[PDB]
Amino acid sequence: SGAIYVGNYRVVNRHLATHNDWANLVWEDSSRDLLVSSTTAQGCDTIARCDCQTGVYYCSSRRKHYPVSFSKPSLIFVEASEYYPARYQSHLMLAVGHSEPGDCGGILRCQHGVVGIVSTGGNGLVGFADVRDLLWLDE
Ligand SMILES: COc1ncccc1NS(=O)(=O)N1CCC[C@H](C(N)=O)C1
Numbered sequence: 001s002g003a004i005y006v007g008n009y010r011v012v013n014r015h016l017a018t019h020n021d022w023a024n025l026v027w028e029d030s031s032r033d034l035l036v037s038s039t040t041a042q043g044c045d046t047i048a049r050c051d052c053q054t055g056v057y058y059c060s061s062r063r064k065h066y067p068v069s070f071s072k073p074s075l076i077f078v079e080a081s082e083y084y085p086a087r088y089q090s091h092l093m094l095a096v097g098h099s100e101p102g103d104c105g106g107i108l109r110c111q112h113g114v115v116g117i118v119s120t121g122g123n124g125l126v127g128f129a130d131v132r133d134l135l136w137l138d139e
């Protein structure tokens with residue numbers, strides 16, 4: 001679990017969005033596993049606008065932060081799950097690191113701000129949904 005809170009927006013994994021997220025929907029994209037809902041309170045986070053390929057993510061299944069080198073956002077094949085059919089997920093960045101399904105929503109940050117959230121994993125890999133190209137989150 002986990003979300004990004006920026007301005008009057010809440011960014012969550014689309015497969016973990018609640019009834020309240022869908023009732024206050026701003027934008028969603030199944031191919032990216034992202035959903036953004038509106039909030040009444042001002043958020044605590046800020047978004048990186050950079051090309052960093054290293055950073056630190058929070059792993060709830062270890063209660064620890066880990067440093068990572070990750071690939072540039074790209075279209076990657078993701079096996080079928082209870083939430084989606086087998087498909088290509090876009091804007092996904094991979095890194096070597098521990099993750100379990102409940103780790104989705106953990107934030108990946110660099111020195112500039114939030115880069116993305118955990119969205120995929122397995123066999124010593126962890127995949128993050130990028131949010132740096134969503135410029136409208138800042139206005
Ligand atoms: C070890 O398993 C995981 N670890 C972290 C996050 C996720 C998994 N499991 S997953 O990649 O199969 N995943 C399951 C939930 C939906 C996700 C999606 N973005 O399509 C894909």
Ligand SMILES: [Zn+2]
Binds near residue numbers: 050052112113
């Ligand atoms: Zn950066």
